[PDB]
Amino acid sequence: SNAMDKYPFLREAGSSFKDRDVTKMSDLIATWDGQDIKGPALIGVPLSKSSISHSGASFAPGTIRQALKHSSAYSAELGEHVVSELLYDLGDIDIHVTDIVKSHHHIFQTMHALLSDHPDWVPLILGGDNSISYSTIKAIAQTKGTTAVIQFDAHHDVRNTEDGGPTNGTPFRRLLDEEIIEGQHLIQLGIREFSNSQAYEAYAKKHNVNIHTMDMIREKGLIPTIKEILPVVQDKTDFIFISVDMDVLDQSHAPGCPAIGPGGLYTDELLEAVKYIAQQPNVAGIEIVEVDPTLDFRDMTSRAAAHVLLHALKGMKLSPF
Amino acid sequence: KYPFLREAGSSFKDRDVTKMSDLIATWDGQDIKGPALIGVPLSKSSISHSGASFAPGTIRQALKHSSAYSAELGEHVVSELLYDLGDIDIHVTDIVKSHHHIFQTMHALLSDHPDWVPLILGGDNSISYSTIKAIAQTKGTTAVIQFDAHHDVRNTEDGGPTNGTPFRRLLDEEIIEGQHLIQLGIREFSNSQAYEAYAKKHNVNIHTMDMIREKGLIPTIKEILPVVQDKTDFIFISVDMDVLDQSHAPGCPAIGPGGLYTDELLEAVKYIAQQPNVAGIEIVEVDPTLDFRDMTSRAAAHVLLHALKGMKLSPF
Amino acid sequence: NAMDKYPFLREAGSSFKDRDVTKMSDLIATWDGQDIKGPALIGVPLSKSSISHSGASFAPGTIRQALKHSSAYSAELGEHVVSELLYDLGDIDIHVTDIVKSHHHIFQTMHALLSDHPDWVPLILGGDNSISYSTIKAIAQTKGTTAVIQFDAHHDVRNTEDGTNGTPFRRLLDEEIIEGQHLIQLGIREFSNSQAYEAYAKKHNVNIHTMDMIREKGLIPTIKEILPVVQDKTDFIFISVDMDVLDQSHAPGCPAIGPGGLYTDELLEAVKYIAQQPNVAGIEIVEVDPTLDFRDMTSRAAAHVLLHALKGMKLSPF
Amino acid sequence: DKYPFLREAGSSFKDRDVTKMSDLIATWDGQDIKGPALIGVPLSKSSISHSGASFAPGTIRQALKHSSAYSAELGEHVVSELLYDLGDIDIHVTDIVKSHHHIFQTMHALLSDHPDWVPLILGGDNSISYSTIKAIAQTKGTTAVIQFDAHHDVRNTEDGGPTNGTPFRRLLDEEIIEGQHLIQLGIREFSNSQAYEAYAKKHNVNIHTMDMIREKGLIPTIKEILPVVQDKTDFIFISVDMDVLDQSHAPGCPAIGPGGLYTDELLEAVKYIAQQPNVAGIEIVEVDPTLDFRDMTSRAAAHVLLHALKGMKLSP
Amino acid sequence: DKYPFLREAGSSFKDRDVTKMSDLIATWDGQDIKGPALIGVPLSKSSISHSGASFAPGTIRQALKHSSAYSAELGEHVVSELLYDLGDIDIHVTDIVKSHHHIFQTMHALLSDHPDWVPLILGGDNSISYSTIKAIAQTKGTTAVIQFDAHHDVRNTEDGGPTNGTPFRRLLDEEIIEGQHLIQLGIREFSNSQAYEAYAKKHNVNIHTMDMIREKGLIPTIKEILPVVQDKTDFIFISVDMDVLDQSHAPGCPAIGPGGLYTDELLEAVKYIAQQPNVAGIEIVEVDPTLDFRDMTSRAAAHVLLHALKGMKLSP
Amino acid sequence: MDKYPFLREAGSSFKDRDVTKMSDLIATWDGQDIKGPALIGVPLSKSSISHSGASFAPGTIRQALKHSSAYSAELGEHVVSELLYDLGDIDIHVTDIVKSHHHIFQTMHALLSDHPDWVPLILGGDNSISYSTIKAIAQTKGTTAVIQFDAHHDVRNTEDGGPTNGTPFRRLLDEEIIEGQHLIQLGIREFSNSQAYEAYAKKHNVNIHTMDMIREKGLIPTIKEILPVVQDKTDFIFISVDMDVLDQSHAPGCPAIGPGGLYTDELLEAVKYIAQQPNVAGIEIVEVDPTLDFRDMTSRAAAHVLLHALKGMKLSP
Ligand SMILES: C[As](C)(=O)[O-]
Ligand SMILES: C[As](C)(=O)[O-]
Ligand SMILES: [Ca+2]
Ligand SMILES: [Ca+2]
Ligand SMILES: [Ca+2]
Ligand SMILES: [Ca+2]
Ligand SMILES: [Ca+2]
Ligand SMILES: [Ca+2]
Ligand SMILES: [Ca+2]
Ligand SMILES: [Ca+2]
Ligand SMILES: [Ca+2]
Ligand SMILES: [Ca+2]
Ligand SMILES: [Ca+2]
Ligand SMILES: [Ca+2]
Ligand SMILES: [Cl-]
Ligand SMILES: [Cl-]
Ligand SMILES: [Cl-]
Ligand SMILES: [Cl-]
Ligand SMILES: [Cl-]
Ligand SMILES: [Cl-]
Ligand SMILES: [Cl-]
Ligand SMILES: [Cl-]
Ligand SMILES: [Cl-]
User: Fold this and answer.
1) Atom of ligand 2 at shortest distance to CA of F294?
2) Torsion (CA) B44, B45, B49, B54 in degrees, nearest 10
3) Cβ(F263) to ligand 2 under 6 A?
4) How far is D61 from D21, CA to CA, in rounded Å?
5) How far is A62 from chain C (nearest CA, A)?
6) Candidates A250, A295, A297: which one to mutate for ligand 1, based on the most atoms within 8 Å of Cβ?
7) Which reactions are catalysed by this chain (chain F)?
């Protein structure tokens, strides 16, 4: 290591501009060796073959990591970095090339073992398509306890399971039907006009899901909408899990989601909401789904996703709990 | 029985989903009651090199993949079915021919089927001359609500019947009156002094982005529409997609900063489409060859969905 | 004929009609169960089976469109390459999520069609490589001892378990549906393969012809020399065209691109030449991915593969 | 200037030891034109398929200008004096029939006023060939046309008007040129219609397919047919339609497919022909920059002109 | 004339009733500069990120030229007589330091020989701001700077030389301007470093974050800090780094992210500031046309220029 | 860590036990002693006359190489048997081109000196790097013949734009770092060059073979006749591959694309033949620009150029 250091101008492959006065996430993220996980740590779930649509979401964990590593870790509103020590990257959950059901078991088992072995781990999950939310939440629910889910989404995601299988749109029907979480502990934020079916809306109502449309959010405001509903739900639950489906964002702000359309959230609105929720007690995890780098302009949507990570971390650093 | 053999190109079907594709039928000559689609694939009329002739296909595709279900209404925006009447035959070479095809086809259909409410898919802005002429001349005295960053009153000497000229022709030819023309979204730096002069000189109701941003789009509409509404028999909605901010409609030939945002436009269209005697709506200046993915075609599909929503709402 | 009164109103999306032109679109008919004589298109939009990300499930759509837009007229023939009509049977339903199921559907469907329509010569539009196992098994078990001509840079004999895009010919050989000595691999490319898989191939006595041999002997010369010998030992031949046999410059839309492949005119000629031979039971085209393509170049290449297949068939002295 | 570091907007790296075509090309000032001179014909609405070939004169100029003028083979510049750029022909945005007269009138007067001008014509779609060839024929005399092309281009005129597919039917039917004086190089399998092929044979057109060419070599087939046609004509005109090239070599043509010419083949052929007595002009058609990869096809077209200039320099 | 349908290479549709910037802008002759004039600075090798900002002066020019000169809200054109285009500053292919010297020397001389010249500067990356501002300050007087930016741009100069992230360190360290005359609008959460924010604070820079701006408003925020700084200075100079805009509004900047200004906000603010007395100039940096969608960001930049032109015209 | 059987390291695709990719063979250099070929990137492109992203090519080429089989069927063995060290990238200054060149020369000179058995596999970077790379070779190893595959002479004067990608063989020749007659230029292309530079090169007696000559005689025979003559006046050979030597259809990601170039087929075969010769001191690949490419076609061709080079070395006495 001094054999190589005698070459002052020789650096490892892929190095970028180094500024000694800068601290970027890349300076704070370490590959995880077995060591004890305290707090937030990243994990990738590159599953996208379950998608109804043709999807490149299996590439998102790579591109979101890249956007994240290239961001400054410094918050001017905190007067400090959002990671105090270091942030582990646990790796990627192995995904079966072929069998989607096998892939889901990989996810549930790894997540379960991980949560149990390291009870202080708060997952930062990089999807992957929407279907992963079944396995991740089930692991939270069956390792942590009664869990509330805050689902940012244009869609209910309660699709019937027999037509496609564990498809993109089925995670929450699977969760509700199997009683992994309760309908009234589910807060859906951003449900969008013309993004849903009559039947599926009915199915979420039967189950007492808390539905907040874009229409409601626009008149009442996102943060006030959450203050109005979150307290009630927290009172019936032990933990909260934040599921961010990036297609809740307006197509102009997230062109890289498979299901794009007008009438959605703007990113700064989302970032603020995530930071708010992240400060609340017993936040068990956050996942980001439905980013598709092959559909993106440059990597705008992966950058937007990375900022969701930064603002969640910010919220956690800020929380009293 | 070839249970696993399927029609070419067919995809995921879901019993619990009702998409527009489930409700749109190829027209077979049956009587037309209410909204029906018609394509107008003309774009050589354009001053700018334009692929707007492909818009009818892309907008159809985006519309067909959308849910027909409205949550605000608790019902689908189309009760029974929605005929797609086809495309107007556009000549390869002669643009004046193409305008005759449009007017004469529109005229015969409005005539044969007095309950047809046209949902017109352009095509570039030049088509408005012939679509509105057919409306005025079959339905009577007509008010036009023109969402546009531009006046569209260019001269005809320099380039023939270009996409820039349709409202000059319409005004000069007294087929509509200026005072029944409502222009929403007229944008600073998008227009010409002499052309604005022409519009004022005809008493066009001009509402700029400045006024809309101050007053708000619907309130701006609620102030002038009632007026024009009571001195006309019918209203027609001309939506030029370049009224939208470039960030929201990246696929229009004439993009720039400082336009309407989509949810804003969508609300305004539903509000107008609720009014009595809406004779039709057309969508122009979508160019899928300039678009990102099909963002701007999806925005146009949603303009239609919201128009349909407003029409479903009207009886109440 | 109620629309005739609207002389300028046409069907949605119908374009420039030229009266003196006959395109494939004019001759391809949506199939409605009628008895099938000769060539008929069928789509197999499976691409999830791909090791790498693949929009191959879209190729049947884009190859269809490129075919339809091509003229049906061959000047070397002085006639259209199809006379009456060419049925399009449709697409094999593939499960969105279950891939074993999808391969069972493909086999079941192909088998039922080949049984019920003995004069059907399948023009199969993939879809990725893995469909070859299901399509060829149907052929061998319904038509009989079958020789395979696979154009390909890769042996496609990858392990079936440990990690299935590059497995079809291992499954094929292992289950003895086909004999290695009846397998002719054309275009196998330097640095596209693994010692183990080549050994597996040489172990089953497959006829391997590398790009080096083909560039030395010439492609047609190579074929004339090996093909008749294999026909002597078999009852049918099946043409499997993996488009990645083509140089990246000629087929940019294949997942596995690299330099040193065949050129498209060189492959078209060879396909025409094979398609005149006795008892051609079918042809398939795999590994076209419209999402990786420039414009639709590779779909156009594939569509021309079909045209030259049809052309050879109409030329066949049998 | 008194500002050593101030240059004209958009200046490029200047290398004193290098001479690019940009250093030799000069906008026409009205002087007498002796030898080759560029003229642009930015017309593409006449195209059957949607086409941006009207941008090609610009993109081809740009690629030509950025090239070296020096031929290592000649040991001199393919033009060491100057090469005028006559400008562009005015294209009506709407009326293509009118646009064709513009082209014919302009070429005819330029040709009549400057008998030593050899046009280097930059299209534009293949439809300009009627008007350019008519001007050469009715100005120079009996003209052989060497038409590099995948297609016969003898489409009937009724369907689309004078589209880019009709030019040689118009020429032959109106007796502007004789069939036996038309040499078609590169006619490609599956690119043509029965009726159109038969039309060509009826007029005794000299048809050389890609198959014949791949069997004999392009130059040998040229050495075999050319002397016959020269024996019965006074002038040669070269019409290069870039879709004669394989799609992998000319991605930017509207009609691409496999099995065409390779660019080096074409370049050698064009230089060989340009060496002959009485080459009256060359045109390049069907370059579409909006469909190209980078500007490959416009670069290929720029080299076609460079190799023509080279051959004209080489002629005894 | 003699050839009626022959026009200059590349000429566009001319319309007689429309005055676009391209009719007003004139390639500079050397005559005395009265008022605003354009000058290009095609430098981007000084950027940390791989950047094509050297193409922006051309793309922004192109966008500007195709824009209407007519301001509806003004009832007149923002330019009255003509607007000179001074040309481009010579940028060395290889030596980034030499390029900065060229910029300062050229700029210094022009502002000395033409005391009435108001620079409309088209970059180029942010690194130019040192040479441009220093030139204003050392030729004009005590200078106030309004920096629209998501970043402080006070990076240390040791790690990479005079890169695009350093200009305000160089400016402050050398006391070319005082920190308390530096107004930073749009400083963005997560776009900056602790040590760099401290350097800015140590120097008493006026820092306004996106957060603060979102609370008070952009125009209010300005009306409140500007008067104070104008007391202490003789001129204000406007530095617009386009990456101050949200990524959805300016996709063509190297450093894109969410949470930025919207183009309409920015345009209003530029207009406001440009009304003030003693505006010595404006520069636009960090537009990268090779990263853009179409030329949206170049159009956005063209429009900034128009709202500043508009602003200057409406003050005595 | 093995505790979680379905957890793997970030970015891990699936591995086939029976496949051997260059990825299974390439290791980050820990300082150990270099025996044979080793990779090294030179991410420099600001020195390019045209706007150039060739600074990204070391990454994209490395990715393409790593994903390629190492197995040569024609050889019946892998082209690497041991391992292949990736030394890393030489640090390129964001701003100072001349300092960056010094960095390259000095890292290069230092490395070749401390590891006598290193055969550099260099990844450009634009062509301006050749000056510092070849100088390091010449002054570290001895008299060197240079075979440059190139459409252009690259003898541009240095005064107009400084040490650009156009100037490396001017600098090399002017400073008598090599002799003209030791430079073999393969692929020099019609209309790609200027009268004055062709003259410079001829004045220096450089061996010039145009595409025309090559198309007439064949690339390999052309080489077979001039190469021994130069090996005769030379102790080592260095292979300089500028990829714009390739036809645009085959290498669309090179800043300078035009028709009438070499095809990758011929180039591959030529590099392998040359790399078979005694005393091949190294190879560099320059002028691939990933930002201009279609997919990564041109980086893939570069990766194959490297594969065939190793194959030649593997195959040499
Ligand atoms: C086309 As966009 C930058 O508004 O997503
Ligand atoms: C798709 As190509 C122009 O590289 O052959
Ligand atoms: Ca969703
Ligand atoms: Ca969802
Ligand atoms: Ca308009
Ligand atoms: Ca408009
Ligand atoms: Ca293969
Ligand atoms: Ca294969
Ligand atoms: Ca033609
Ligand atoms: Ca043609
Ligand atoms: Ca900035
Ligand atoms: Ca900045
Ligand atoms: Ca070169
Ligand atoms: Ca070179
Ligand atoms: Cl979803
Ligand atoms: Cl318009
Ligand atoms: Cl894909
Ligand atoms: Cl494969
Ligand atoms: Cl287009
Ligand atoms: Cl044609
Ligand atoms: Cl910056
Ligand atoms: Cl770049
Ligand atoms: Cl070079």
Assistant:
1) 4
2) -60
3) no
4) 10
5) 14
6) A297
7) N-formimidoyl-L-glutamate + H2O = formamide + L-glutamate
Q: What residue ranges line ligand 1, CB within 6 angstroms?
A: A 252, 255, 297; B 247, 250, 292; E 248, 251, 293
Find, among F174, F228, F163, F219, the residue nearest to F201 by Cα.
F174
Residue with tokens 């107004």: E183
Nearest-CA neighbor of E80 among E16, E14, E15, E24?
E24
DSSP classification of residue C262:
B
Our answer on whether the CB atom of F249 is closer than 6 Å to any ligand 2 atom is: yes
- Looking at the DSSP bridge assignments, the partners of residue F242 are F286
Q: Which of B74, B263, B298 sits opposite A260 (nearest CB)?
A: B298
Nearest to C206 by CA among C173, C232, C180: C180
Cβ neighbors of E85 (< 8 A, separation 6 or more) are D9, E25, E26, E27, E28, E37, E38, E39, E61
E153 assigned binding-site residue: yes
Preferred mutation among D48, D50, D189 to probe C, highest tally of C CBs within 10 A:
D189
C191 backbone dihedrals φ, ψ, rounded to 5° = 75, 10
DSSP 8-state secondary structure symbol assigned to residue E254: S
E26 φ, ψ (degrees, to nearest 5) = -130, 125
Describe the crossing of helices B217-230 and B262-272 by its angle, rounded to 10 degrees: 30
Residue D48 near residue D165, CB atoms below 8 Å: yes
Subunits touching F (CB < 8 Å, at least 3 pairs)?
A: A, C, D, E
Q: What is the DSSP letter of D252?
A: T
Q: Which residues sit opposite F119 in a β-bridge? A: F37
Which class for A93: exposed (0-12), middle (13-18), buried (19 or more C-beta within 10 A)?
A: buried
Resolution of the coordinates, Å: 2.2
- Cβ contact B105–C2 (<8 Å): no
- Single out the residue of F163, F133, F139 nearest to residue F241, CA to CA: F133
In a domain? residue F10: no
Q: What backbone phi and psi angles, to 5 degrees, belong to F289?
A: -120, 100
Ligand having the closest approach to the CA of B54:
19
Which of D242, D247, D291 has the most ligand 2 atoms within 8 A of CB, as the residue to mutate? D247
For residues D92, D98, D101, D102, the Cα torsion angle rounded to the nearest 10 degrees is -20
Task: Tell me which of D245, D248, D295 to substitute to probe ligand 2's pocket, judged by most ligand atoms within 8 Å of the beta carbon.
Answer: D248
Distance CA E305, CA A117 (A): 60
Copy the structure tokens of residue A199: 């039947």
Torsion-angle region of residue E186: left (phi > 0), alpha (psi -120 to 50) or beta? left
**CATH number for position C217:** 3.40.800.10
Distance CA A194, CA A213 (A): 11
CA C133 to chain centre: 13
- Biggest CA–CA distance in chain A, Å, is 70
Question: Which helix (DSSP H) or strand (DSSP E) does residue F69 occupy?
Answer: none
**Residue E151 known to bind ligand:** yes
Report if residue F13 sits inside a domain: no
Is residue C11 a part of any domain in this protein? no
Report the half-sphere exposure of B79 (CA within 13 A, side-chain side): 6
Secondary structure (3-state) at C105: helix
**Chains near B (3 or more Cβ pairs under 8 Å):** A, C, D, E
Tell me the two tokens of residue E166. Answer: 């350093």
Domain range holding A128? 26-319
Q: What angle do CA E12, E16, E17 make, to 5 degrees?
A: 120
The residue whose CA is least distant from atom 5 of ligand 2 is D248
Helix (H) or strand (E) holding B116: strand B116-122
Burial environment of residue B21 by CB neighbours within 10 A (0 to 12, 13 to 18, 19 or more): middle
Q: Least CA distance to B104: which residue of chain C?
A: C8
- Per the structure, how many domains does chain A have? 1
Query: Cβ F30–A113 below 8 Å, yes or no?
Result: no
Domain presence at residue E202: yes
